[PDB]
Amino acid sequence: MTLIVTGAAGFIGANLVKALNERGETRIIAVDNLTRADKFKNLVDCEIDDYLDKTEFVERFARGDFGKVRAVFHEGACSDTMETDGRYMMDNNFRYSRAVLDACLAQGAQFLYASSAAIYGGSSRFVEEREVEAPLNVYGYSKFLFDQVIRRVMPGAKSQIAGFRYFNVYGPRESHKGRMASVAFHNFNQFRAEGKVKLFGEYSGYGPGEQTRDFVSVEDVAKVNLYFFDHPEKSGIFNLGTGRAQPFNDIAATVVNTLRALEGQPALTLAEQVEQGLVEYVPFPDALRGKYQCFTQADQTKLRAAGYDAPFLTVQEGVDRYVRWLFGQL
Amino acid sequence: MTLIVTGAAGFIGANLVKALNERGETRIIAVDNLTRADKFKNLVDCEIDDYLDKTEFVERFARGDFGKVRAVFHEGACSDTMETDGRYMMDNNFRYSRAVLDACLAQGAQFLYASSAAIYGGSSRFVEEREVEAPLNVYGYSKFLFDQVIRRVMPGAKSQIAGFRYFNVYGPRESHKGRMASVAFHNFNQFRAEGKVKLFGEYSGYGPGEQTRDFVSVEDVAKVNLYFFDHPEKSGIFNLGTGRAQPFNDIAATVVNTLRALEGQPALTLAEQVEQGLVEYVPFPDALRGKYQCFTQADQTKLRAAGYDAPFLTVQEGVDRYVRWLFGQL
Amino acid sequence: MTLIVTGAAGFIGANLVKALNERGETRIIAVDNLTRADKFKNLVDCEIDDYLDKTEFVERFARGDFGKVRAVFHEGACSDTMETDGRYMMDNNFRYSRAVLDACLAQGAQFLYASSAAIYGGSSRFVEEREVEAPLNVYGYSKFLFDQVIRRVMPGAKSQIAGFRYFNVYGPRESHKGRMASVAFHNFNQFRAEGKVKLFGEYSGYGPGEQTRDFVSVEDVAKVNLYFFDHPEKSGIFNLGTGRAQPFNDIAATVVNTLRALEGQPALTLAEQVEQGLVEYVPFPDALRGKYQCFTQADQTKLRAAGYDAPFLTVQEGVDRYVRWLFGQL
Ligand SMILES: NC(=O)c1ccc[n+]([C@@H]2O[C@H](COP(=O)([O-])OP(=O)(O)OC[C@H]3O[C@@H](n4cnc5c(N)ncnc54)[C@H](OP(=O)(O)O)[C@@H]3O)[C@@H](O)[C@H]2O)c1
Ligand SMILES: NC(=O)c1ccc[n+]([C@@H]2O[C@H](COP(=O)([O-])OP(=O)(O)OC[C@H]3O[C@@H](n4cnc5c(N)ncnc54)[C@H](OP(=O)(O)O)[C@@H]3O)[C@@H](O)[C@H]2O)c1
Numbered sequence: 001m002t003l004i005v006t007g008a009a010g011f012i013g014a015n016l017v018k019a020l021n022e023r024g025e026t027r028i029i030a031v032d033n034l035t036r037a038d039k040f041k042n043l044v045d046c047e048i049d050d051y052l053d054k055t056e057f058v059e060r061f062a063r064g065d066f067g068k069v070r071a072v073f074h075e076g077a078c079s080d081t082m083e084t085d086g087r088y089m090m091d092n093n094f095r096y097s098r099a100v101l102d103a104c105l106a107q108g109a110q111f112l113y114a115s116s117a118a119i120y121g122g123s124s125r126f127v128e129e130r131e132v133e134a135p136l137n138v139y140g141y142s143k144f145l146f147d148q149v150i151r152r153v154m155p156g157a158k159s160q161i162a163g164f165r166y167f168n169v170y171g172p173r174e175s176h177k178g179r180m181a182s183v184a185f186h187n188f189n190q191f192r193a194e195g196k197v198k199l200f201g202e203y204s205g206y207g208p209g210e211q212t213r214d215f216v217s218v219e220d221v222a223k224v225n226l227y228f229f230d231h232p233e234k235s236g237i238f239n240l241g242t243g244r245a246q247p248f249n250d251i252a253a254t255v256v257n258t259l260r261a262l263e264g265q266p267a268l269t270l271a272e273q274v275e276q277g278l279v280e281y282v283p284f285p286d287a288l289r290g291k292y293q294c295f296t297q298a299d300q301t302k303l304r305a306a307g308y309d310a311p312f313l314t315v316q317e318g319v320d321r322y323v324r325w326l327f328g329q330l
Numbered sequence: 331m332t333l334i335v336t337g338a339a340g341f342i343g344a345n346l347v348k349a350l351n352e353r354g355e356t357r358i359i360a361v362d363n364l365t366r367a368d369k370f371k372n373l374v375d376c377e378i379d380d381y382l383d384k385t386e387f388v389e390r391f392a393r394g395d396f397g398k399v400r401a402v403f404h405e406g407a408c409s410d411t412m413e414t415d416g417r418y419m420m421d422n423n424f425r426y427s428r429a430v431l432d433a434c435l436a437q438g439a440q441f442l443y444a445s446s447a448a449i450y451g452g453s454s455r456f457v458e459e460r461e462v463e464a465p466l467n468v469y470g471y472s473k474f475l476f477d478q479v480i481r482r483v484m485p486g487a488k489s490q491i492a493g494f495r496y497f498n499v500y501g502p503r504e505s506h507k508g509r510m511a512s513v514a515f516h517n518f519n520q521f522r523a524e525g526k527v528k529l530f531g532e533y534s535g536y537g538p539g540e541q542t543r544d545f546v547s548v549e550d551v552a553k554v555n556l557y558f559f560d561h562p563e564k565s566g567i568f569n570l571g572t573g574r575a576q577p578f579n580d581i582a583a584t585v586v587n588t589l590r591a592l593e594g595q596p597a598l599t600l601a602e603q604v605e606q607g608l609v610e611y612v613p614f615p616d617a618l619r620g621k622y623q624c625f626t627q628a629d630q631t632k633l634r635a636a637g638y639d640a641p642f643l644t645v646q647e648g649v650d651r652y653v654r655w656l657f658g659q660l
Numbered sequence: 661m662t663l664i665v666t667g668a669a670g671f672i673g674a675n676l677v678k679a680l681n682e683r684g685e686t687r688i689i690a691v692d693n694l695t696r697a698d699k700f701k702n703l704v705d706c707e708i709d710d711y712l713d714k715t716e717f718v719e720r721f722a723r724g725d726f727g728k729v730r731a732v733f734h735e736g737a738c739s740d741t742m743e744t745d746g747r748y749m750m751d752n753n754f755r756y757s758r759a760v761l762d763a764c765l766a767q768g769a770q771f772l773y774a775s776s777a778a779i780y781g782g783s784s785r786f787v788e789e790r791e792v793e794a795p796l797n798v799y800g801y802s803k804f805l806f807d808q809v810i811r812r813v814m815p816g817a818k819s820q821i822a823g824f825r826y827f828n829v830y831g832p833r834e835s836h837k838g839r840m841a842s843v844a845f846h847n848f849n850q851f852r853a854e855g856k857v858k859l860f861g862e863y864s865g866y867g868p869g870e871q872t873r874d875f876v877s878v879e880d881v882a883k884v885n886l887y888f889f890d891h892p893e894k895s896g897i898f899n900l901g902t903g904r905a906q907p908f909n910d911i912a913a914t915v916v917n918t919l920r921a922l923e924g925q926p927a928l929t930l931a932e933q934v935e936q937g938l939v940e941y942v943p944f945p946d947a948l949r950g951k952y953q954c955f956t957q958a959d960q961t962k963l964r965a966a967g968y969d970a971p972f973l974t975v976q977e978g979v980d981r982y983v984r985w986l987f988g989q990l
């Protein structure tokens with residue numbers, strides 16, 4: 001009956017908590033780090049039995065302080081793809097994940113954790129295979145390396161181990177994420193303030209805004225998590241995206257067109273938006289050269305094969321919906 | 331026989347200590363943090379058995395260093411609503427509270443603790459139910475989450491669990507609270523120093539000074555605590571206010587008129603005070619936008635239904651008396 | 661045919677040039693100081709024969725560089741009531757006026773010049789008599805003293821000498837005046853930028869926004885000027901105000917209601933606007949204490965008796981038109 005969500009105050013974690021709550025699961029231990037306070041807003045409409053700081057958790061879990069725990073959704077991680085202290089990164093992501101996993105295996109708790117497509121780096125295949133993994137930054141490396149450990153532990157594991165390589169995740173509860181929030185959230189606040197949105201210009205062969213990613217709503221991230229939570233016999237590392245890749249232009253053009261409908265104005269093509277200065281491009285930062293993915297697209301074979309067969313919200317549906325939820329404040 | 335008050339050197343905890351002394355209860359263990367040394371003034375006219383820093387107390391209380399303890403008045407918390415380190419807020423408030431609760435439950439000691447009307451946030455109703463609780467800042471969240479825990483502990487709880495959601499408390503012994511002391515106290519000093527008082531202006535559709543709160547003197551706060559102390563059979567989460575919501579304008583008008591009256595001057599209406607420059611309005615801080623409660627009014631129903639039928643001082647009686655008490659200094 | 665206007669690129673001067681332009685007079689020497697370049701806008705739709713800086717003008721004028729000159733409209737002065745260098749103020753205002761006056765007398769030219777109601781200081785009568793004149797700042801004194809000199813020179817003067825004590829003037833071509841522009845102009849920009857307007861709070865027994873002035877449109881100012889221009893037989897020093905005094909609140913509220921009417925919204929009362937936060941009050945600046953007129957109202961007796969019988973635009977007609985015109989930039 002007792003559930004544990006780490007990263008609970010965060011974008012994905014709190015979304016999981018909300019989804020658990022909505023199916024009546026409420027005996028939840030929330031673990032996070034509230035040093036940046038505003039995250040708390042994410043848990044205000046939630047039901048949990050306890051809160052701990054990430055520094056007090058592991059040793060108390062291991063000790064059995066929370067009793068009989070059914071599952072741990074391990075979303076807690078430093079998600080700053082620009083953080084430079086790799087020692088911190090490896091301790092806070094990799095080592096920590098390991099102590100959590102060891103505690104789950106020692107107790108028979110299901111272990112559902114967040115991985116990242118950043119692991120793929122500049123690959124042209126996105127299949128859950130070591131062969132094609134080569135992360136561009138130390139964040140991606142911390143995730144990559146934990147995935148390697150998972151592959152060694154999985155065959156001998158009697159309790160569930162399910163890892164999700166989230167792609168570009170967007171949706172409610174990311175408001176606190178700063179520069180690490182999604183492009184859609186960024187585009188939203190930009191249009192509210194300056195009446196126009198921003199995207200990176202040309203870089204490494206891709207036109208302005210033509211860099212493409214697989215954008216997934218949290219709604220679908222939470223659905224997938226619950227599916228494997230419900231099937232403790234399914235273990236593995238799974239891509240979690242839509243299998244459909246789109247340029248950043250679609251995010252921007254969509255956010256703009258949806259904010260215009262909310263005020264009466266008719267939809268515009270991307271080109272009209274650029275023409276009218278509704279979309280403008282910022283020159284690509286030197287700090288991100290060689291460390292940036294210009295293309296990602298989930299191969300969906302593995303996830304579908306495991307029996308998750310529901311459709312995924314498209315950019316059009318999901319971003320439009322997300323902007324409207326965002327607009328819900330005036 | 332041994333009593334313990336945390337927050338002992340602060341506003342409400344020191345009023346509790348004195349109230350206990352005024353009934354021959356003097357075997358008190360006092361717990362606070364004297365880093366800001368001026369607080370000591372709150373215990374000079376008091377009788378206590380011991381003083382401990384908040385950091386060395388929880389260890390000694392569980393270990394039973396204080397012998398048999400009848401009750402704990404857990405008033406100690408970080409009361410700075412603008413404190414921004416949520417990790418500290420959750421540790422010093424929430425986690426600390428649970429530890430005190432756990433030791434209290436372990437030893438069958440009564441547990442009377444301070445909550446806060448901040449928990450209700452911008453809600454339209456003020457009844458002790460999860461459905462109207464939405465805190466606006468992390469301070470509120472730390473009080474909120476402890477209350478949720480108490481609702482899970484309570485049914486099984488052998489011993490007394492008394493939690494009081496204080497509203498806007500004013501009165502003596504709050505002199506050290508700086509920017510967190512009551513508006514009454516601020517106005518007094520302001521008047522003494524500049525010959526005028528200040529209030530926030532228009533914010534969120536409330537006119538200047540027209541934001542409204544439920545103001546309760548400490549005296550009433552101290553009576554309610556003693557009542558539940560005398561009644562270990564009574565347990566619950568109670569609103570502690572007067573049921574009567576007044577605008578900030580009233581406090582100021584009262585402070586100005588009481589201070590005028592102390593110098594043989596006639597009373598003015600608010601409309602005269604504003605026209606005379608005795609009341610002026612500072613524009614509303616952007617640091618408070620969306621984090622500020624514009625309306626509170628205690629729903630007394632649950633507190634009455636527990637046998638506390640005594641009447642509460644009004645703003646006119648309480649502020650007047652407090653202002654006169656303050657005027658005692660030269 | 662040759663006409664001179666000092667302060668030509670400033671507020672009143674440029675209105676004189678345009679009005680003269682509109683009855684066929686285009687033989688105009690313009691004299692100003694364009695260091696703050698933006699005043700140049702004031703002359704764009706105008707016809708002038710020459711432009712000189714104020715520092716090179718007087719020598720050339722007295723020497724006869726401009727040939728026969730019918731009249732000089734002397735509007736050029738430092739109009740910063742908050743300027744603290746009184747040596748500069750007396751040189752740029754008082755001595756400059758005397759040098760221009762002398763040259764006029766010797767050439768036989770009409771001399772129309774700007775005085776100021778600032779001359780009356782905190783007086784309770786506003787008649788053109790020495791007995792009720794006592795300026796509060798050095799600006800006022802520079803005009804005050806010059807007027808005394810005119811009263812000595814006028815008896816045996818062969819050409820026209822007309823001096824106008826402008827009250828609070830408002831209207832187009834004051835965009836460059838900064839903190840010295842009319843309150844109507846300030847409110848317009850305050851409202852366009854923040855959807856609310858600012859006025860001074862209580863000072864010296866006048867409530868928030870209650871200090872009153874005699875507000876006169878530049879159109880009337882230009883009209884009175886043109887009248888005496890037409891009648892060289894009339895000399896003297898005259899009040900140029902409406903005879904009607906309103907509080908600043910009237911200006912504020914008239915500006916708000918007029919802008920609201922343009923966005924379709926309904927008109928509000930002053931107390932409504934104050935309660936809604938549309939009008940807020942700034943603490944009176946110490947730098948103005950004892951240097952600030954709380955009341956002005958022109959006694960029109962002398963102006964009428966000289967022949968000027970026309971009606972003056974009131975605040976409601978004038979400010980409304982000023983606001984609509986100002987709104988013409990979008
Ligand atoms: N598009 C996406 O959002 C995306 C894509 C790929 C992977 N992911 C993964 O999704 C997970 C959650 O991401 P998110 O979007 O929700 O970011 P997030 O909002 O920052 O959530 C993470 C929260 O957990 C905290 N935390 C960090 N390390 C922790 C630890 N060792 N134990 C417990 N809590 C910890 C973080 O706070 P502090 O860091 O300040 O301590 C943060 O508040 C991460 O594992 C991330 O790698 C997300
Ligand atoms: N208007 C009100 O007065 C109001 C309204 C709602 C709730 N409350 C609650 O009433 C209680 C008392 O508030 P107050 O007005 O008396 O403010 P206070 O004067 O600041 O009292 C708290 C004192 O306890 C200290 N303290 C902080 N954390 C502690 C801990 N974990 N253990 C022991 N002592 C600790 C504080 O010092 P440091 O913070 O410097 O460490 C402070 O001296 C608080 O819990 C507050 O949340 C008050």
Ligand SMILES: NC(=O)c1ccc[n+]([C@@H]2O[C@H](COP(=O)([O-])OP(=O)(O)OC[C@H]3O[C@@H](n4cnc5c(N)ncnc54)[C@H](OP(=O)(O)O)[C@@H]3O)[C@@H](O)[C@H]2O)c1
Binds near residue numbers: 739774829830
């Ligand atoms: N509320 C009112 O509008 C009001 C009330 C009473 C009297 N007045 C008088 O009306 C006249 C015009 O005022 P205004 O509202 O039009 O202000 P203005 O816009 O500042 O116009 C005056 C212009 O004359 C320039 N100037 C200063 N000294 C000069 C000089 N010795 N010779 C030639 N030009 C000079 C000024 O530039 P710099 O100063 O930067 O050098 C300024 O550009 C002033 O004499 C003023 O005292 C106005």
